[PDB]
Ligand SMILES: Nc1nc2c(ncn2[C@@H]2O[C@H](COP(=O)(O)OP(=O)(O)O)[C@@H](O)[C@H]2O)c(=O)[nH]1
């Protein structure tokens with residue numbers, strides 16, 4: 001199954017791709033617009049194989065390559081079986097994704113299931129782990145420190 | 161199966177080749193040098209023979225930090241290749257010997273690593289497509305943009321590996 005990592009620039013999408021991959025598969029920097037190309041990694045949880053797909057942070061970009069990467073990111077979303085909507089927790093205390101970015105949520109294919117991932121729990125102090133908002137799955141992790149990425153691994157097995 | 165790494169200077173047509181081999185638009189291609197930075201890996205098959213194709217950032221002295229980093233990762237894939245396709249923009253030089261095109265690059269490769277010199281953009285130079293040899297290296301003239309000469313590459317990849 002195709003699981004697409006998507007959200008704003010600098011949310012930590014590539015860190016999570018790397019954590020899920022177990023491998024420095026995507027470049028990771030604090031410069032917004034680091035990922036432009038779509039990056040795919042084939043993994044296996046527990047007998048369940050999936051493609052995890054890292055994408056350019058969504059925005060209106062004047063960098064042409066990034067502009068193209070954002071086109072393709074939306075195209076990956078269109079074909080996704082699940083989106084992991086990645087949020088930098090330090091930027092908002094909001095947990096309902098309609099409060100975080102309604103425009104993005106509203107644009108997503110109807111009934112494409114969304115897992116909301118409040119990342120950088122290491123700066124927030126947020127309590128780690130899974131819950132649910134407005135019927136959307138909600139995982140609090142650190143992609144950088146691996147802290148709580150395990151629950152997400154199990155979540156994917158369960159839900160897919 | 162084995163790992164084929166596409167390497168060379170920026171804008172040589174390495175992503176264009178990856179997409180022609182993969183039969184789909186895996187890598188972003190533009191006229192802008194420094195488009196590719198992350199390493200892109202595609203798994204393909206030729207005549208049933210499985211093959212890994214790795215696209216890399218063009219090697220240059222880059223001002224952009226993400227690109228500098230992709231260049232490092234590009235080298236770290238090269239070190240680990242079973243073959244390198246050394247892609248050269250044909251309209252930039254009439255040279256065929258990789259030693260005349262970029263000696264530094266050629267010398268830094270691991271001792272055992274074979275290389276196929278690919279002279280890309282043959283649609284512009286008008287050079288005859290197909291296979292030859294320079295100084296013991298395999299040599300191929302093709303257009304990744306049009307796909308002309310790429311079957312010769314595919315056949316060379318199956319025979320060579
Ligand atoms: N402190 C902390 N930083 C993170 C975490 N995840 C990502 N980052 C950092 O935030 C910046 C952007 O990360 P990256 O994965 O490349 O973001 P992307 O643009 O969404 O893919 C980098 O400096 C990362 O090291 C996290 O869980 N905790």
Ligand SMILES: Nc1nc2c(ncn2[C@@H]2O[C@H](COP(=O)(O)OP(=O)(O)O)[C@@H](O)[C@H]2O)c(=O)[nH]1
Nearest residue numbers: 171172173174175176189190191281303304305
């Ligand atoms: N005329 C011609 N143009 C090409 C060919 N291959 C690539 N290009 C163009 O050269 C530019 C750089 O190509 P790209 O594949 O992104 O280069 P890379 O930086 O080495 O990956 C783009 O404008 C391509 O369309 C070719 O065989 N013929």
Ligand code: ALF
Nearest residue numbers: 009010034035057
């Ligand atoms: F801002 Al990014 F990958 F570098 F979304």
Ligand code: ALF
Nearest residue numbers: 170171194195218
């Ligand atoms: F210049 Al490139 F991939 F964009 F080597």
Ligand SMILES: [Mg+2]
Nearest residue numbers: 013014034035
């Ligand atoms: Mg990224």
Ligand SMILES: [Mg+2]
Nearest residue numbers: 174175195196
């Ligand atoms: Mg390229």
Ligand SMILES: [Rb+]
Nearest residue numbers: 029031032034
């Ligand atoms: Rb980034």
Ligand SMILES: [Rb+]
Nearest residue numbers: 171190192195
């Ligand atoms: Rb390019």
